[PDB]
């Protein structure tokens, strides 16, 4: 399989989080992966908000669709990985889920 890597840069604009994805070549993208083989997608948190963001998981409105097989997370909340093991065809949408140190609300990336 292929191991893809995307950096999740989070800044604040007008006091609220903005998610900017950058790829291996440092280019801004939308952090979509059209996947053609079994593999992994690794998302690395670059928190520039001063709000103590940490990944707590990856959320799905259609979590049983089989497009993503599993989610793994590092102990420090700096990395999350999506595993696609069994190549179920189709498309799914997801939102990162993060804790923050300013309040007890979870943070979601846009739908």
């Amino acid at each position: 399989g292929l191991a893809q890597f995307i950096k999740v840069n989070v800044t604040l604009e007008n006091g609220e989080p903005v998610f900017i994805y950058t790829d291996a070549n440092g280019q801004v993208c939308q952090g979509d992966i059209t996947v053609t083989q079994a593999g992994t997608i690794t998302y690395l948190l670059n928190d520039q908000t001063l709000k103590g963001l940490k990944f707590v998981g990856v959320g799905f409105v259609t979590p049983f669709d089989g497009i993503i097989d599993a989610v793994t997370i590092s102990s420090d909340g700096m990395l999350v990985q999506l595993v696609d093991l069994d190549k179920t065809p189709g498309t799914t949408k997801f939102q990162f889920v993060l804790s923050n140190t300013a309040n007890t609300l979870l943070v979601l990336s846009p739908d």
Binding site: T34, V35, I67, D84, G90, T91, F94
Partner: peptide
Amino acid sequence: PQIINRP
């Protein structure tokens, strides 16, 4: 983001 599986 979105993921598109094209096996």
